[PDB]
Amino acid sequence: PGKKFVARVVEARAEDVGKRVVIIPKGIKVGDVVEVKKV
Amino acid sequence: KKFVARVVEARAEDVGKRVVIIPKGIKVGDVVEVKKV
């Protein structure tokens, strides 16, 4: 990896409850791709 | 564009909300920087 990954923004589902996620604020759409870096 | 956030445990109230799923190696409470590609 490298503390840095890419991921497609999705809509959370019932099966996601309890899973590690980051909440996506307004301005970034479902289907948009984001780069995520643990600092 | 770009934002800072902390990794959280998804809850029932998040169903239907915009999220990114966090892979293994990053824990709840970890600070991440997120930017749209």
Residue numbers in the entry:
A (entry chain B): 4 to 42
B (entry chain A): 6 to 42
Question: Can you list sentences taken from the study reporting this PDB entry?
Answer:
Here, we study fold transition between distinct β-barrels by protein engineering and structural biology technique. Here, we discover that the previously reconstructed ancient DPBB sequence could also adopt a β-barrel fold named Double-Zeta β-barrel (DZBB), as a metamorphic protein. The DZBB fold is not found in any modern protein, although its structure shares similarities with RIFT and OB. Furthermore, the reconstructed OB fold could also be converted to the four-stranded SH3 fold by a simple circular permutation. Thus, these ancient β-barrel folds (DPBB, RIFT, OB, and SH3) could be readily interconverted by a few feasible mutations through the missing-link fold, DZBB, indicating their significantly close evolutionary relationships.
To test this assumption, we conducted the reverse engineering by replacing segment 1 of design-13 and design-16 with the 8-amino acid sequence forming the Z-loop of design-2 (the 3rd generation mutants: design-18 (tkoL2_v1.2_Z) and design-19 (mkaL2_v1.2_Z)). SEC and CD experiments demonstrated that both mutants folded and had moderate thermal stabilities. The crystal structures of design-18 and design-19 revealed that they adopt the DZBB fold even without the α1 region (segment 2). These results demonstrated that the segment 1 is sufficient to archive the fold-change from DZBB to OB. Most DNA molecules did not migrate from the well when mixed with the proteins with the stable DZBB fold (design-2, -18, and -19) and RIFT fold (design-3 and -4), indicating that these proteins formed large aggregates with dsDNA. In particular, design-2, -18, -19, -3, and -4 interacted with dsDNA even in high salt conditions (500 mM NaCl). Design-2, -18, -19, -3, and -4 might interact with the phosphate groups in the DNA backbone in a similar way to the sulfate ions in the crystal structures of DZBB.
